[PDB]
Scaffold this motif. Structure first.
Motif, short mmCIF file in Angstrom:
data_model
loop_
_atom_site.label_atom_id
_atom_site.label_comp_id
_atom_site.label_asym_id
_atom_site.label_seq_id
_atom_site.Cartn_x
_atom_site.Cartn_y
_atom_site.Cartn_z
N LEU A 63 0.99 -0.17 2.23
CA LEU A 63 0.78 -0.52 0.82
C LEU A 63 1.68 -1.68 0.41
O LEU A 63 1.20 -2.70 -0.08
N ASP A 64 2.99 -1.51 0.60
CA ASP A 64 3.95 -2.54 0.25
C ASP A 64 4.84 -2.88 1.44
O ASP A 64 4.61 -2.41 2.55
N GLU A 65 5.85 -3.71 1.20
CA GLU A 65 6.78 -4.11 2.25
C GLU A 65 8.21 -3.71 1.91
O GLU A 65 8.98 -3.33 2.79
N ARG A 66 8.55 -3.78 0.63
CA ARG A 66 9.88 -3.42 0.17
C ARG A 66 9.90 -2.00 -0.39
O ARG A 66 10.78 -1.20 -0.08
N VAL A 67 8.91 -1.69 -1.23
CA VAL A 67 8.82 -0.37 -1.84
C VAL A 67 7.78 0.49 -1.13
O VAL A 67 7.02 1.23 -1.76
N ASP A 68 7.74 0.39 0.20
CA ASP A 68 6.80 1.15 1.00
C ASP A 68 7.25 2.61 1.13
O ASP A 68 6.43 3.53 1.03
N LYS A 69 8.54 2.81 1.34
CA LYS A 69 9.10 4.14 1.48
C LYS A 69 9.14 4.86 0.14
O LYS A 69 9.32 6.08 0.07
N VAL A 70 8.97 4.10 -0.94
CA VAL A 70 8.99 4.66 -2.28
C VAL A 70 7.73 5.48 -2.55
O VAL A 70 7.70 6.31 -3.46
N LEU A 71 6.70 5.24 -1.76
CA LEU A 71 5.43 5.95 -1.91
C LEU A 71 5.08 6.71 -0.63
O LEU A 71 4.02 7.33 -0.54
N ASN A 72 5.97 6.66 0.35
CA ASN A 72 5.76 7.34 1.62
C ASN A 72 6.86 8.36 1.88
O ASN A 72 6.63 9.38 2.53
N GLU A 73 8.06 8.08 1.38
CA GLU A 73 9.19 8.97 1.56
C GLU A 73 9.59 9.62 0.24
O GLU A 73 9.85 10.83 0.18
N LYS A 74 9.62 8.83 -0.82
CA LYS A 74 9.98 9.33 -2.15
C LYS A 74 9.10 10.50 -2.54
O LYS A 74 9.57 11.49 -3.10
N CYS A 75 7.81 10.39 -2.25
CA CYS A 75 6.85 11.44 -2.57
C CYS A 75 5.45 11.06 -2.12
O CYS A 75 4.67 10.50 -2.89
N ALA A 126 0.81 9.02 -9.26
CA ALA A 126 2.25 9.09 -9.04
C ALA A 126 2.77 7.82 -8.38
O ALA A 126 3.88 7.37 -8.66
N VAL A 127 1.95 7.24 -7.50
CA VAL A 127 2.33 6.02 -6.80
C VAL A 127 2.70 4.91 -7.78
O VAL A 127 3.44 3.99 -7.44
N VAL A 128 2.19 5.02 -9.01
CA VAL A 128 2.48 4.03 -10.04
C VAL A 128 3.86 4.26 -10.65
O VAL A 128 4.76 3.44 -10.47
N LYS A 129 4.01 5.36 -11.37
CA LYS A 129 5.28 5.69 -12.01
C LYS A 129 6.40 5.75 -10.98
O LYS A 129 7.57 5.54 -11.30
N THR A 130 6.04 6.05 -9.73
CA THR A 130 7.02 6.14 -8.65
C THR A 130 7.46 4.76 -8.19
O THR A 130 8.55 4.59 -7.65
#
Length: 112
Positions: A28-40, A61-65
């Motif tokens: 999905l992303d390159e910098r905030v990839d773990k934000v939507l894969n690890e964060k939740c 959630a991927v948005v607000k996250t």
């Protein structure tokens, strides 16, 4: 143990609870990839649901996250306002629209 309202030890799990567990880890992303894969990236799937229904509950959630500094994303090319109004094609490990224990998140369509 996503069990119904008032129920417990009726027979077994993933059969009566009427729910499941699925994760997302494709791209999905390159910098905030773990934000939507690890964060939740874990989500529950009811009994009677469609592969498209999760595209509105998972992408949400991927948005607000991922709203730390949209000012940057928009500057790089990644739009946050589009994520909420974008298509989320959930693929499987075979290349189809399935909602197994693990489903990939592809932006491109299946084939139609």
């Amino acid at each position: 143990a996503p069990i119904k309202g008032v129920t417990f030890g009726e027979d077994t799990v993933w059969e009566v609870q009427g729910y499941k567990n699925v994760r997302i880890t494709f791209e999905l992303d390159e910098r905030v990839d773990k934000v939507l894969n690890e964060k939740c990236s874990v989500y529950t799937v009811e009994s009677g649901t469609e592969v498209t229904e999760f595209a509105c509950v998972v992408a949400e959630a991927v948005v607000k996250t991922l709203q730390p500094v949209s000012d940057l994303l928009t500057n790089m090319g990644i739009d946050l306002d589009e994520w909420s109004v974008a298509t989320f094609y959930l693929f499987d490990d075979a290349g189809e629209e399935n909602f197994s224990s693990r489903m990939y998140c592809s932006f491109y369509p299946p084939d139609e």
